[PDB]
Amino acid sequence: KDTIALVVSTLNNPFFVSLKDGAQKEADKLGYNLVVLDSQNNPAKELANVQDLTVRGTKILLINPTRSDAVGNAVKMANQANIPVITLDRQATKGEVVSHIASDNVLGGKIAGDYIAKKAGEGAKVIELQGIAGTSAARERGEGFQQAVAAHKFNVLASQPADFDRIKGLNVMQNLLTAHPDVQAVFAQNDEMALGALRALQTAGKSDVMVVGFDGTPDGEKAVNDGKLAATIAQLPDQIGAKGVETADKVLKGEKVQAKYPVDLKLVVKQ
């Protein structure tokens, strides 16, 4: 069997273990042998991992960077050895990458909007709490949410940035509540902003307003479990790993692949 190499940022966290497990599972399915090197969250260890792989003549490199800005030299070493690079979750600031695989933020915003339409119905009155202006997260999530607005003809009462921060989310929500008391649902572009908004609604005595967050952070999860937050959107690490291998399979075969492959996210509701 041919070998696919995965350099993972770390293995000290469940998210990264799942990524490795999904890669492994897809490797087994497609008949490949998977080499896994743990960078231990250290950029020096990451560089040495790639170097180690280049001396052995690995055919493809799947790399989940420790930090986007730290990985460039490791990527260029792979480029110099003619070893195709595929990045997972975080991009490489520098270096040539054949394909990048990550959670689709546009799809995520759309999912959040589809869920608002599911529970609050077509044409609902909504408020969007946006993230830091200029970030890819705020832009993509807002883009996905706009698709939902167009698909479900939502009445967007307001859309204001709260810069991915809890306190600003609360203040902005409190402000917009005085202006639009008939708001039916809120799409907050991160869990922190969703939690701030929930506090504002709680203080105002409005528990009927359906709030959807994004990230699936422990606190966002907690808000869902406690029955306060309607939903949050979580990344699927196993599938990033899987899509990575699937794309590596195509690259190894000589197929011309896309620069980016979107990975689904899942809705997280109370159980």
Resolution (A): 2.1
Do residues 212 and 206 make contact, with C-beta atoms less than 8 angstroms apart?
Answer: no
Interruptions in the chain after residues (C–N over 2.5 Å)? none
**Domain co-membership, 62 together with 123:** no
Rounded Cα distance, 185 and 118, in Å: 11
What are the residues whose beta carbons fall under 8 Å from the beta carbon of 121, sequence distance 6 or more?
none
Q: What are the start-end ranges of the E strands in the chain?
A: 3-8, 33-38, 61-63, 85-88, 99-103, 125-130, 155-161, 185-188, 210-212, 232-235, 260-263, 265-268
**Domain co-membership, 93 together with 113:** no
Rounded Cα distance, 78 and 75, in Å: 5
Local structure of 74: helix, strand or coil: helix
Which DSSP state fits 99? E
Buried b (16+ CB within 10 A) or exposed e, 178-191: eeeeebbbbbbbbb
* Joined tokens for residue 28: 């087994």
Rounded Cα distance, 65 and 72, in Å: 9
Report which residue type is found at 20.
Answer: K
Rounded Cα distance, 41 and 15, in Å: 13
Report which residue type is found at 184.
Answer: Q
**Domain co-membership, 225 together with 245:** no
List the domain range (segments joined by +) for residue 7.
Answer: 1-101+238-261
* Joined tokens for residue 244: 């990575």
**Domain co-membership, 181 together with 206:** yes
Angle at 77 between CA 73 and CA 78, to 5 degrees: 120
- Length of the chain in terms of residues written: 271
Write the CATH number for 246: 3.40.50.2300
* Joined tokens for residue 164: 């991915």
**Domain co-membership, 257 together with 268:** no
Quote the number of domains for the chain.
2
Strands 265-268 and 232-235: antiparallel
**Domain co-membership, 232 together with 120:** yes
Which of 64, 15, 59, 73 is closest to 38 using CA atoms? 64
What are the residues whose beta carbons fall under 8 Å from the beta carbon of 161, sequence distance 6 or more?
129, 130, 131, 132, 133, 138, 172
**Domain co-membership, 91 together with 132:** no
Which DSSP state fits 215? B
**Domain co-membership, 81 together with 153:** no
**Domain co-membership, 163 together with 270:** yes
Local structure of 1: helix, strand or coil: coil
**Domain co-membership, 95 together with 112:** no
